[PDB]
Structure formats: C-alpha cells, structure tokens
Design a protein around this ligand. Structure first.
Ligand SMILES: CN(Cc1cnc2nc(N)nc(N)c2n1)c1ccc(C(=O)N[C@@H](CCC(=O)O)C(=O)O)cc1
Ligand SMILES: CN(Cc1cnc2nc(N)nc(N)c2n1)c1ccc(C(=O)N[C@@H](CCC(=O)O)C(=O)O)cc1
Ligand SMILES: [Ca+2]
Ligand SMILES: [Cl-]
Ligand SMILES: [Cl-]
Lengths: 159, 159
C-alpha cells in the first residue's frame, strides 16, 4: 500500500526548494513516528532540504539526475522506485510536488499536517476530492512556545 | 567583557507569543559557535523555551523566582549573574528583552543575526545608537534548502 505524507499551508501550498517559514517540531515528530521502519520515496529538492539519509528508513530518491551519494538508492522512474521498496506493508511518499502528482493515483492513504500559515508559493499539493477519500482521523493543536503555528493532523483513506 | 547575542527580525523583533516562524539552522550554528565554552546568561522565559541546558556552556538563569532545575545556576541579580561567571574573558547574554535591556549598558560587543522576516512582535531588542557602535564583520546569505529566510550576521564593537 502506498501512502503520501505532506505538510500543507493554507491553500495547499507546499515547499518547492527553500525551507518553509515555520518551526513545528511536533509535526516533525509525527512525521518521524509515521515513517520510521518504512521505505520513503522523495524527489531531489526534498533530499537537499533533508540533507542526510533519514535514519531507520530505506531512502529512495526519484530523479533524472545522478546519484551523488552511496548511502541512498537513486531511481529514475516510478516503477523502479516501487520495485526498490521490496514487499512491505506500506511505502511512504514524502514529496515534493511532482513526486506527489506521480503517486497520488496509486495512493490508498494520506497523512496530512494542515498548518495555519499563509505562504506565497508556486507549488500546491495535488487536488484531492475528499469524496474519494474518507477523513478518518483529525486532531487540532494550537501554536505554543515550541510550535510557530496552529496545526491539524489528518488521515484520509481512499474510498 | 560582556557581549549580547540576538536574532532580530525587521523592526528589531526578537520574540512573539509563540515560537518564531522561521527555520534557520545556519543561524543556530552561528549562535553555537559564538557561545560554546562560555558562560551564557538568560532570562526565565528564554530558559523555558530552550527546554534543556545548552551543552558545553555554563548556563546561568536570571530570575526573581525559584530554581526549578539542578542542572543550571539560578541568580537573582545582574550582580550575582556576573559573579557566577568567574574569571572569563567574555560573558554572553542570550536574551530575552528585559535581560538585554539590563545588560546593554555594560556591553562592549553585539553579535547580531538580522533576519528578513516581517512579524508582529511581542518583545523587541533595545534601541541601539548606530553612532556608538562600529560594525567589524558582516555576511549576507539568502534563504536556501534548509533556511527559510535571508539573514545577515554582524558583529559590532562599542566605539
Ligand atoms: C525538509 N524535510 C521534509 C519534510 C518535512 N516535514 C514534513 N512533514 C510532513 N508532515 N510531511 C512531509 N512529507 C514532510 N517532509 C524534512 C527535514 C528534516 C527531517 C528530519 O530531521 N526528521 C527527523 C526528525 C527530526 C530531528 O531529529 O531533528 C526524522 O527522524 O524524521 C524530516 C523531513
Ligand atoms: C529559543 N532559543 C533562543 C535563541 C535562539 N536563537 C538565537 N540566535 C541568536 N543569534 N541569538 C540568540 N540569543 C538566540 N537565542 C534557542 C533554542 C534552541 C537552541 C539550540 O538548540 N542551540 C544548540 C544548537 C542547535 C541544534 O543542535 O539544533 C546549541 O548548541 O546552541 C538555542 C537557542
Ligand atoms: Ca566596518
Ligand atoms: Cl522534491
Ligand atoms: Cl527571558
């Protein structure tokens, strides 16, 4: 089963290249809890923003360009990315935009962090008609001394 | 001598009700570099925001209220704060607003990170007179894959 995990600002704006203007360690903990011990597929820009292999996960980079680093798996197509995962219960696709667009059709679950931040951006998370998806869990949190903005975790299942 | 080290958004904003809406590991690395192996003096709110004692530094908390952690030194006056420092070449004051206000008058140097972020602030860095300070180092950087906003590091020495 393929799942997409994303952090979205108002209007579904997502990061493109530069780091997003927010500080949400609680959201990063949610991210870690949901991807640990699973294969993660990301595009090149996401890899650069991360800056190192995520520990405890099989890191797969989908890109047309060459594999800089030997610590991760470089793939050139969706098929190859899938194959590289082997046979596991759940594959996590962590972005960016183009990567999400390529896997959404095959996706069965969405883990989303909705953040109350108005960011100007070009890229948006693909349009999902939540009537093709059942929202199964939603939990809101206010901003605090450690988290810059209000955020809401949501899990949606493909119906 | 005493030095103040701070991260200022536009209009000299240093703090908000919640965590600052930025992600700047480069600025945190500059903060680490310049405070390592030195005593650091902070107010209670800054302490609570950090969450733990800063490694490799002597952590001194200036507050009217009682000590909640055995890992740090709790002081009740600027005078006591200074004394707790011992015989060191440089004492770093890391905030917040009220602490900076109390130490500015005794400071000989400022290490500033100016960040291009427009935010409604709660607390601001005390107004400094540009005629009283000399900039001896400046370095600009744009936002990138890991840093959400452009910033510039500056070190000023009292004329
Ligand atoms: C830029 N980036 C991509 C990123 C960030 N937040 C997301 N958040 C959500 N919800 N979804 C994503 N796909 C997502 N992707 C990053 C950057 C750093 C780490 C990271 O350091 N993660 C550590 C946890 C934090 C830490 O140890 O500092 C981990 O083990 O996952 C993760 C993703
Ligand atoms: C909230 N806060 C106060 C803070 C933040 N940035 C600043 N930046 C500058 N330039 N000046 C300050 N006084 C300053 N103070 C913090 C929070 C965390 C860490 C921190 O984790 N510092 C690690 C470095 C970062 C890391 O390991 O992620 C250190 O060793 O100094 C420091 C200050
Ligand atoms: Ca100069
Ligand atoms: Cl990407
Ligand atoms: Cl404080």
């Amino acid at each position: 089963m393929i799942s997409l995990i994303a952090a979205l600002a108002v209007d579904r704006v997502i990061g493109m290249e530069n780091a997003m203007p927010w500080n949400l360690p609680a959201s990063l903990a949610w991210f870690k809890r949901n991807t640990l011990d699973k294969p993660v597929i990301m595009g090149r820009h996401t890899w650069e923003s991360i800056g190192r292999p995520l520990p405890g996960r099989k890191n797969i980079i989908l890109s047309s360009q060459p594999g800089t680093d030997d610590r991760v798996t470089w793939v050139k197509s969706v098929d190859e990315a899938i194959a590289a995962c082997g046979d596991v219960p759940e594959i996590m696709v962590i972005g960016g935009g183009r990567v999400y667009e390529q896997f959404l059709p095959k996706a069965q679950k969405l883990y989303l962090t909705h953040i109350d931040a108005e960011v100007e951006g070009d890229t948006h998370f693909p349009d999902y008609e939540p009537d093709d998806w059942e929202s199964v869990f939603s939990e809101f949190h206010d901003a605090d001394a450690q988290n810059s903005h209000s955020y809401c975790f949501e899990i949606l299942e493909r119906r």
